[PDB]
Design a protein around this ligand. Structure first.
Ligand SMILES: CCCCCCCCCCCCCCCCCC(=O)OC[C@H](COP(=O)([O-])OCC(O)COP(=O)([O-])OC[C@@H](COC(=O)CCCCCCCCCCCCCCCCC)OC(=O)CCCCCCCCCCCCCCCCC)OC(=O)CCCCCCCCCCCCCCCCC
Ligand code: HEA
Ligand code: HEA
Ligand SMILES: CCCCCCCCCCCCCCCCCC(=O)OC[C@H](COP(=O)([O-])OCC[N+](C)(C)C)OC(=O)CCCCCCCCCCCCCCCCC
Ligand SMILES: CCCCCCCCCCCCCCCCCC(=O)OC[C@H](COP(=O)([O-])OCC[N+](C)(C)C)OC(=O)CCCCCCCCCCCCCCCCC
Ligand SMILES: CCCCCCCCCCCCCCCCCC(=O)OC[C@H](COP(=O)(O)OCCN)OC(=O)CCCCCCCCCCCCCCCCC
Ligand SMILES: [Cu+2]
Ligand SMILES: [Cu+2]
Ligand SMILES: [Cu+2]
Ligand SMILES: [Mg+2]
Lengths: 196, 495, 151, 52, 88, 55
C-alpha cells in the first residue's frame, strides 16, 4: 500500500494526531460523566454549596489552551508543506470547468456509460514523480476540481485563475468530483486523473 | 358574532403585549419547523432510493436542488430564530427583569408581522410558482444570477424574503438591547440579570453588526439579476459575494446557538435546584464567543484560493473561538454535579442529549478548522454531519428542553412524560442514524448536494434510510402528543 | 370578562370614559381602571383548568375542527398546494413506495447488500434475492413507468 | 441578652415555657405544611418523588 | 356524573363485611395544575363516609343483626349506607 | 401543653392497635367488587353487567 503523494501523507498524519488527542479528551470526560451520573441517579453526593471553585476553573480554562497551540502549529506547517512544491515544475496543464464536463488542454471529458458515475471517456494524464502545475478556472459558473486522495481541492471560479501544484507517486487512476453545486448535472461531472 | 370575530382579529394583529407576540413567534416557528421537516423527508426519500426514483429525470434535478435550498432557508431563518429568540425572548425578557413591556412596544409587532410577510412571500414564491430558486441556501453567484434554471421573478421574491427577515431581526435585536439596558428594576445591576438576558443581549449585538452586510450582498445579487451589472460575473468577484455573505454567515450561526445556552442554563437552575457553577464564568464565556465570532468568517472559504497567510490566520482564529465553548461545556458538566435534577424528566434527558451532541459536533467542527485538513473535507458529507449534529441535535434538543419546561407554565397542564420519552428517545436514535454515517461518508469522498451517488456509498445511505423511518415515527409521535395535550379525555367508565 | 363600565362611570375621572360610547372596544382601546378584571393569556385554558377541563373537547365538532386547524392546518394546506403544483412528484413517490417502480432490476438476480462498516468492502457484503418474487407476487417488472434515461 | 445569672435563670424558665407552648406547635404545624404541599404536588401533577 | 354513595356489603351466614362503591376511571393523560379533584366516590359530600366507616368498623366486626336491611338479589349480602354513623 | 397531652394520648392509643390491625371479619376487595358488578345495576347502562367491561 502506497500513499500516492507526500502531501496526502502529511495530512493523514496530522489527522491521526488530532484524532488521538480528541479521543483521549473524550475518554477522560466519559469517565467523569459516568462517575457523576452514577452518583446522581442513586441520590448520592448532594451539595448545594458547590457552585464555585476558583482553582479548578482557572486550570480547566488553561489546559485546553496549551494542548491547542501544538495543533495550531502543526496545522500551519502542514499548510506550508502543501504549498512549497510550487516553482519546481516542468509541465503545465490548464483545466476548464464547463457546464457538466471538464476540458483539459482543449480536450473535452464527459461521463461515459461503461462506468456508472466514476469513469470518464477522456482522462487527464500526468507523469509519475514529475511536478506539474495546474491552472484551473471555469467558463460559466463555479465548479471545484476535487481530487482529495492526492490532497487537491481547488475551486474553479469564473474570471479567477487558480494555480495549484500537483505531484503523483503511485501509478493508476484517481477518481474525483466537482465538489461544488453547479446545476442539474452536478452529480454527474466526474474527474479522472491517470498517473503513468 | 361579527363583533367577536373582529375583536379576535384585532387582538392578534394590533397587539403589542410581549406575551402575545411571543406566543405568535412560537407558533410560526413550530409551523415552519414542521414544513422544513416535510421537505427534509422528501430529500431523504430522494437519497435513499436509487435511480432518481422521485424526479425520474436528470433534467429535473432542479426540483431536488430547490428542495435543499428551501429546506436550508426555512429551517435556519424561520424555525430556530423565531423560536429560540422570538418566542422565549419576548415572553420572558420583560418578566425576568421585572418590567411591564419591552421598549418600543410597536416595533415588536412590526417585527413579527415583517416575519409573517417574509414567510408568505417565500411560501407563495416557492410553491405556487414554477421553476423556483434552486441554488443552495448559500446563494452563490453566478449560479443564482447567470443561470438557465434561475430566471423567473420568484427568485427575486426569495431574495426579498431574505431582506424582510433581516429587517425583522434587526428590529428585534435593537428592542431587546434597549429593554434590557434601562428598564431593570431597582437593585439589579447590568451583570446580575440572569443568564438568559445576557445571552440575548450578546445575540442582539451580533445581529446588529452583520445584517447590513448581508443586505449589501443581496442587493448586489438583485442588481446583477435585474439591471444587468457585472459585480459577480466573469468580470466580477463572486469571491467578493462569498466574503460578504460569510461575514454574515458565521455570526448567524452563533446567534442561533447562544440563546440555546441561555435557555438551558435557566432551565437547569429551575430543575436541578442549584445555581449555575461559575455563573460569571459562563457569562464572560458567552460574550467571548460573541466577540470572537466576528474574526473567523473565512474558514468557510479555505478552497476559494485565499492567501496562504490568511489560511493560517483563519485556522488560528477558529481554534481561539473553540476555547471558551470548551470552558462552557465543562461548566455545564460541573453544574449538573451535586444537583438534584429530576430523575424522570424529559427536560433532564434532553439536556443530556444536548450536552453530548454539542460536544461531538464541536469536536467534528474543530477538525474542519484546520486549513490543510479542510482541503479533504470541504463540500463533502462531513460538513453536513457537522452542522446537523449541531443544529439538529444541540439546538433542537435545547428547544425541546425549553418546550417541555415551559408548556405547563404557559398552559397550566402537566406533561405526559411517557409520551414525551418515546418522542425524545426516538428522535435521538433516529437522528443519530441519519447524520453519524455522514461523517464517515465524508472522509470517503462523497460530495454534497448530489441526488445520485456512486455505488461505493450504499451502506451509509442504508443506515440513513433506517434513520429516516425512525424520524418519521418520532415526529408523528410529537405532533400527536401535542394534539393530545389540549384535548379532554376520550374514555371513561366505572371500575 | 364582564365589563366594568359601571365602576368606570362611577369612578374618579369619568370624563375619560366618554369615548366608550363611540365605536370603541372596551378591552383594547380604553383607559384601564383600578378595579378592572384581571385578563389572562389563554382565556380558554385559564377558565378550563381550574374546573379540571382541557380547553378543547373532541366530542364537539366545532372544538374538534378548531383544534385540528390549530395543529394540522397549515401543514395540510402546504401539502395540498404542493400536491396540486407537483402532481408528478407524489405520483413517482407513490410508485416507488409501492414497489411498482424498479430502476433496472431483473428477474432472479442477486444484488449487493451492506448495512455499515464504511464504503463497499467485499469482505463484509451479502447478496440478496427479492423475497417478493421468491414468494411469487412478482413475475415481471412494469415498463410503462417513467425511466430516467441518460443516467 | 441575659447579663447576670438571675437573668439567665429567668430566660431559661421563659424558654422552657415557650418551648412547651409555642415552639413545638410551630414545628408540628410546619411539618404538616410540608407534607401537605408534598401531597398537593403528587398524583401526577408535579415532580414529587423524582429526587430527594 | 351522579352514582350511588359508597355502601357496606355484609354477608349474614358468613358474617363478613366490607366497604364498596363506584370508582370512576378514565384514560390517563396530562393533569391540571389549578384543580384538586373533588369528592368523586361520594359526590356532593364533605367526605364524611370515611369517618362513618371508621366509627362503624367496630360495630360491624363485633357482629351486627342486620335483618332490617335490604338484600342484594338472591345472595346473602345486605347493603348498609354510610350516610350517618352506624350504632344500632 | 394540650398538644403534649394529645400526643401522649394518641401514642398510648395506637399501642392498642387500629382497625386495620384489629379487625378480623373483613372481606377482600376483589370479592366485593365482583359482587358489585355481578348484582348491582351499572350507573351508565342502567342494567346489570356480568363483569367489568371497558366500553
Ligand atoms: C389557515 C391557518 C391560519 C393560522 C392558524 C389558525 C388556527 C385557528 C383557525 C380557526 O378556525 O380558529 C377558530 C378559533 C376560534 O377560537 P375559539 O376556540 O372559539 O375561542 C374564542 C377566543 O379565541 C378565545 O380563545 P383564546 O383567546 O383562549 O384562544 C384559544 C387558544 C387556543 O390555543 C391553544 O390552545 C394553542 C395555541 C398555541 C400557540 C403557540 C404557543 C407556543 C408554542 C406551543 C407548541 C405548539 C406549536 C403549534 C402547533 C404545532 C405542534 C407540533 O389560542 C388560540 O386559539 C390562538 C393562539 C395563537 C395561535 C394562532 C395565531 C393566529 C393568528 C396569527 C397568524 C400568523 C401566524 C400563523 C401562520 C399564518 O380561533 C382562535 O382560537 C384563534 C383566534 C383567531 C386567529 C386569527 C387572527 C387573525 C390573523 C390574520 C393573519 C392570518 C395569517 C396571514 C394570512 C395572509 C393572507 C394569506
Ligand atoms: C436548523 C437547521 C436545520 C434543521 C432542523 C435540519 C433538519 C434535517 N435535515 Fe438539514 N440542512 C440544513 C439545516 C437544517 N436541517 C442546512 C442549512 C442545509 C444545507 C442546505 C444546503 O446544503 O444548501 C441542510 C441540508 C440537508 C441535507 C442535504 C442533502 C444534500 O445536501 O445532499 C439533508 C439530507 O440528508 C438534510 C437532512 C435533514 C434531516 C433528515 C432533518 C431532520 O429531519 C432531523 C431532525 C428533525 C427534527 C424533528 C427537527 C424538525 C423540527 C420540528 C419537529 C419542530 C418541532 C419543535 C421543536 C422540537 C422545537 N439536511
Ligand atoms: C449551528 C451551530 C454551529 C456551531 C456551534 C458551530 C461551531 C463550529 N464550527 Fe461550524 N457550521 C455550522 C454551524 C455551527 N458550527 C453550519 C450550519 C455550517 C455549514 C454552513 C454550510 O456550509 O452550509 C458550519 C460549517 C463549518 C465549517 C465549514 C467547513 C467547510 O465548509 O469547509 C467549519 C470549518 O472551519 C466549521 C468550524 C466550526 C468550529 C471550528 C466550531 C467551534 O465553535 C466548535 C467549538 C466546540 C468545541 C470545541 C467543543 C468543546 C470541546 C471541548 C469540550 C474541549 C476540547 C477543546 C480543545 C482541545 C481546544 N463549521
Ligand atoms: C439583510 C439586511 C436588512 C436591512 C438591515 C438594515 C436596517 C433595516 C431597518 C431597521 C430598523 C431599526 C429601527 C431601530 C429603532 C429606530 C428608532 C425607534 O424605533 O424609535 C422609537 C419609535 C418606535 O417605537 P414606539 O413607537 O413603540 O415608541 C415607544 C414610545 N416612545 C416614543 C415614548 C418611546 O420610533 C418612532 O417613534 C419613529 C420610528 C419610525 C420608523 C419608520 C418610519 C419610516 C418607514 C419607512 C418609510 C419608507 C422608506 C422607503
Ligand atoms: C461484540 C458485538 C459487537 C457489536 C455488534 C454489532 C456490530 C457488528 C460488528 C461491527 C464491526 C463491523 C461493522 C458491520 C456492522 C456495523 C453496524 C453499524 O451500526 O454500523 C455503524 C458504524 C459504522 O462504523 P464502522 O463499522 O465502519 O466502524 C469503523 C470500523 N473500522 C475499524 C473497520 C474502520 O459501526 C460502528 O460504529 C461499529 C459498532 C456498531 C455497534 C452498534 C451498537 C449500538 C446499536 C444502536 C442501534 C442500531 C440498530 C441496528 C439494528 C440492526 C439489527 C436489527
Ligand atoms: C470587529 C469587526 C471587524 C473584524 C475584522 C477582522 C479582520 C480579519 C482579517 C481580514 C482579512 O484580511 O481577511 C482576509 C480576507 C481575504 O483575504 P485575501 O483577499 O485572500 O487576501 C488579500 C488578497 N490581496 O479579507 C477580506 O475578506 C477583507 C475583509 C476586510 C475587513 C472587513 C471587516 C468588516 C467591516 C464591516 C463591519 C465592521 C464592524 C463590525
Ligand atoms: Cu460542476
Ligand atoms: Cu458541480
Ligand atoms: Cu463559521
Ligand atoms: Mg464550496
Amino acid at each position: 500500500m502506497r500513499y500516492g503523494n507526500r502531501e496526502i501523507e502529511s495530512i493523514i498524519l496530522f489527522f491521526d494526531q488530532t484524532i488521538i488527542l480528541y479521543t483521549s479528551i473524550i475518554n477522560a470526560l466519559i469517565v467523569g460523566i459516568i462517575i457523576i451520573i452514577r452518583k446522581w441517579y442513586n441520590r448520592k453526593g448532594i451539595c448545594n454549596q458547590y457552585i464555585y471553585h476558583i482553582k479548578i476553573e482557572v486550570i480547566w480554562t488553561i489546559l485546553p489552551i496549551i494542548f491547542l497551540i501544538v495543533i495550531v502549529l502543526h496545522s500551519v506547517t502542514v499548510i506550508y508543506n502543501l504549498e512549497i512544491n510550487k516553482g519546481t515544475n516542468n509541465k503545465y496543464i490548464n483545466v476548464i470547468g464547463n457546464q457538466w464536463y471538464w476540458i483539459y488542454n482543449n480536450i473535452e471529458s464527459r461521463i461515459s456509460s461503461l462506468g456508472r458515475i466514476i469513469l470518464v471517456d477522456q482522462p487527464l494524464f500526468i507523469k509519475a514523480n514529475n511536478n506539474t502545475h495546474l491552472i484551473i478556472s471555469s467558463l460559466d459558473v463555479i465548479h471545484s476540481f476535487a481530487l482529495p486522495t492526492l490532497g487537491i481541492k481547488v475551486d474553479a471560479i469564473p474570471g479567477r485563475i487558480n494555480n495549484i501544484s500537483i505531484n503523483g507517486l503511485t501509478q493508476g487512476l484517481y477518481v474525483g468530483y466537482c465538489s461544488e453545486l453547479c446545476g442539474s448535472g452536478h452529480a454527474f461531472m466526474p474527474i479522472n486523473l491517470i498517473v503513468y | 358574532m361579527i363583533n367577536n370575530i373582529m375583536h379576535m382579529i384585532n387582538k392578534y394583529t394590533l397587539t403589542t403585549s410581549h406575551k402575545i407576540i411571543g406566543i405568535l413567534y412560537g407558533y410560526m416557528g413550530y409551523i415552519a419547523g414542521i414544513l422544513g421537516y416535510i421537505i427534509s423527508m422528501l430529500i431523504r426519500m430522494e437519497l435513499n432510493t436509487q435511480g432518481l426514483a422521485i424526479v425520474r429525470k436528470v433534467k429535473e434535478v432542479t426540483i431536488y436542488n430547490n428542495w435543499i435550498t428551501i429546506h436550508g432557508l426555512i429551517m435556519l431563518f424561520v424555525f430556530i430564530m423565531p423560536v429560540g429568540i422570538g418566542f422565549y425572548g419576548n415572553y420572558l425578557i420583560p418578566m425576568l427583569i421585572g418590567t411591564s413591556e419591552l421598549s418600543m412596544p410597536r416595533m415588536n409587532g412590526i417585527s413579527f408581522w415583517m416575519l409573517i410577510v417574509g414567510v408568505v412571500i417565500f411560501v407563495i414564491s416557492n410553491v405556487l410558482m414554477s421553476k423556483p430558486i434552486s441554488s443552495g441556501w448559500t446563494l452563490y453567484p453566478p449560479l443564482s444570477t447567470r443561470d438557465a434554471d434561475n430566471i423567473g421573478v420568484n427568485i427575486d421574491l426569495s431574495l426579498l424574503v431574505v431582506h424582510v427577515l433581516g429587517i425583522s431581526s434587526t428590529i428585534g435585536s435593537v428592542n431587546y438591547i434597549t429593554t434590557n439596558k434601562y428598564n431593570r428594576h431597582v437593585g439589579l445591576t447590568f451583570m446580575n440579570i440572569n443568564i438568559y438576558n445576557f445571552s440575548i443581549i450578546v445575540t442582539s449585538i451580533l445581529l446588529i453588526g452583520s445584517l447590513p452586510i448581508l443586505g449589501v450582498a443581496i442587493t448586489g445579487l438583485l442588481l446583477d439579476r435585474n439591471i444587468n451589472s457585472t459585480i459577480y460575473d466573469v468580470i466580477g468577484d463572486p469571491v467578493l459575494y462569498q466574503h460578504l455573505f460569510w461575514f454574515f454567515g458565521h455570526p448567524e450561526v452563533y446567534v442561533i446557538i447562544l440563546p440555546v445556552f441561555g435557555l438551558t442554563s435557566l432551565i437547569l437552575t429551575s430543575i436541578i435546584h442549584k445555581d449555575i457553577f461559575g455563573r460569571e464564568g459562563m457569562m464572560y464565556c458567552i460574550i467571548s464567543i460573541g466577540v470572537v465570532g466576528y474574526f473567523v468568517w473565512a474558514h468557510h472559504m479555505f478552497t476559494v484560493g485565499l492567501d496562504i497567510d490568511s489560511r493560517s490566520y483563519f485556522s488560528i482564529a477558529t481554534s481561539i473561538i473553540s476555547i471558551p465553548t470548551s470552558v462552557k461545556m465543562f461548566s455545564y458538566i460541573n453544574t449538573w454535579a451535586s444537583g438534584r435534577g429530576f430523575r424522570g424528566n424529559n427536560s433532564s434527558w434532553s439536556f443530556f442529549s444536548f450536552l453530548i451532541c454539542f460536544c461531538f459536533g464541536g469536536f467534528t467542527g474543530l477538525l474542519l478548522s484546520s486549513g490543510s485538513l479542510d482541503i479533504m473535507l470541504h463540500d463533502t458529507y462531513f460538513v453536513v454531519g457537522h452542522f446537523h449534529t449541531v443544529l439538529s441535535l444541540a439546538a433542537t434538543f435545547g428547544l425541546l428542553i425549553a418546550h417541555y419546561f415551559f408548556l405547563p407554565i404557559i398552559f397550566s397542564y402537566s406533561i405526559f412524560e411517557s409520551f414525551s420519552f418515546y418522542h425524545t428517545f426516538l428522535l435521538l436514535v433516529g437522528a443519530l442514524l441519519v447524520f453519524y454515517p455522514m461523517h464517515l461518508a465524508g472522509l470517503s469522498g462523497m460530495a454534497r448536494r448530489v441526488p445520485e451517488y456512486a455505488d461505493i456509498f450504499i451502506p451509509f445511505m442504508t443506515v440513513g434510510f433506517h434513520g429516516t423511518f425512525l424520524l418519521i415515527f418520532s415526529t408523528l409521535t410529537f405532533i400527536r402528543s401535542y394534539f393530545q395535550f389540549l384535548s379532554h379525555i376520550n374514555h371513561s367508565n366505572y371500575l | 370578562h364582564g365589563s366594568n363600565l359601571y365602576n368606570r362611570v362611577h369612578g374618579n375621572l369619568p370624563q375619560l370614559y366618554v369615548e366608550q360610547l363611540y365605536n370603541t372596544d372596551e378591552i383594547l382601546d380604553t383607559v384601564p381602571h383600578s378595579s378592572d378584571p384581571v385578563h389572562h393569556m389563554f382565556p380558554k385554558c385559564a377558565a378550563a383548568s381550574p374546573l379540571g377541563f382541557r380547553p378543547y373537547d373532541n366530542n364537539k365538532l366545532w372544538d374538534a375542527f378548531v383544534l385540528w386547524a390549530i395543529v394540522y392546518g397549515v401543514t395540510t394546506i402546504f401539502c395540498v398546494l404542493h400536491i396540486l403544483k407537483y402532481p408528478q412528484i407524489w405520483k413517482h413517490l407513490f410508485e416507488t413506495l409501492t414497489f411498482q417502480y424498479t430502476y433496472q432490476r431483473e428477474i432472479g438476480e442477486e444484488y449487493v447488500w451492506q448495512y455499515g462498516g464504511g464504503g463497499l468492502n467485499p469482505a463484509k457484503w451479502r447478496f440478496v434475492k427479492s423475497p417478493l418474487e421468491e414468494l411469487g407476487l412478482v413475475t415481471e417488472y412494469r415498463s410503462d413507468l417513467d425511466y430516467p434515461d441518460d443516467l | 441578652v441575659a447579663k447576670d445569672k438571675y437573668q439567665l435563670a429567668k430566660q431559661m424558665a421563659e424558654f422552657q415555657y415557650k418551648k412547651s407552648y409555642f415552639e413545638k406547635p410551630w414545628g408540628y404545624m410546619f411539618a404538616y405544611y410540608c407534607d401537605e404541599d408534598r401531597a398537593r404536588l403528587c398524583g401526577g401533577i408535579g415532580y414529587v418523588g423524582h429526587h430527594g | 356524573m351522579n352514582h350511588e354513595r359508597p355502601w357496606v356489603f355484609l354477608n349474614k351466614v358468613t358474617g363478613k363485611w366490607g366497604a364498596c362503591g363506584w370508582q370512576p376511571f378514565w384514560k390517563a393523560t396530562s393533569q391540571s395544575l389549578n384543580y384538586i379533584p373533588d369528592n368523586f366516590i361520594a359526590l356532593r359530600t364533605n367526605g364524611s363516609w370515611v369517618r362513618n366507616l371508621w366509627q362503624s368498623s367496630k360495630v360491624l366486626d363485633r357482629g351486627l343483626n342486620a335483618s332490617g336491611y335490604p338484600t342484594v338479589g338472591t345472595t346473602d349480602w345486605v347493603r348498609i349506607p354510610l350516610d350517618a354513623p352506624l350504632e344500632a | 401543653s394540650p398538644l403534649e397531652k394529645a400526643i401522649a394520648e394518641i401514642n398510648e392509643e395506637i399501642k392498642s392497635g387500629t382497625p386495620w390491625d384489629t379487625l378480623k371479619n373483613r372481606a377482600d376487595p376483589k370479592e366485593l367488587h365482583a359482587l358489585k358488578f355481578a348484582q348491582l345495576p351499572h350507573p351508565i347502562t342502567k342494567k346489570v353487567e356480568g363483569k367489568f367491561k371497558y366500553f
